[PDB]
Structure formats: structure tokens, C-alpha cells
């Protein structure tokens, strides 16, 4: 049950240009890194630039700098390493063999 493809864009620049991603700051730590590989990864990568916020602002928008062509397939990566990331670092935690009602 499923079908369907579309994704026209006409644009053409130079200059890069900031964009805004939904993240949890509680994946921030995991998504940098020891010092800051993880990411370096990316940046050498999909060719961007990425900003996390700092743990005093207590932000879950990171910032990619970029052009749009490569804030796309950049975001892309990231969106989906989220999803994917708390779907295991949540797993683990899901399954709380405990008492109460749970579901099987």
C-alpha cells in the first residue's frame, strides 16, 4: 500500500545558508562525539557545516550550514540517525521487565 514520487526544486546560489533541525540534546553527547568526529564524518562527507547548541541553552535545534542542495542530503543522514539512535539507546529502556500491565 504504497506508491508515489515527487521532489522538484529550481535554485541556484553560491553563498550557503543556515537551516534548523529537530534533535534531542539527550543525543547531542552520542551525535559529537568524544571530541567531535562523529560529525567531522558528515561535514567531509555531505560537504557542511554543522552547529550544535551549547548545553547552557538547553536547545534541541541544531543549525547546518550549507547549500540547500547539500542541507538536503545532510539533514537527510542526521534525521534519520536520530530515529535510529533513540530507537536503540530507547530499546533497552523500553523493555523494563518489571510488574505492572505490559504488552507483548
Known sequence: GSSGSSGKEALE????????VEVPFDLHRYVIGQKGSGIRKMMDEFE?????PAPELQSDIIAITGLAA???????GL?????????????????????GPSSG
Do not use: G, M, W, Y
Open 13 to 20: 546560489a553560491l553563498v550557503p545558508v543556515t537551516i534548523e
Open 48 to 52: 557542511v557545516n554543522i552547529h550544535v
Open 70 to 76: 547539500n542541507l538536503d542530503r545532510a539533514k537527510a
Open 79 to 99: 534525521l534519520e540517525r536520530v530515529k535510529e539512535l533513540q530507537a536503540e539507546q530507547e530499546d533497552r529502556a523500553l523493555r523494563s521487565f518489571k510488574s
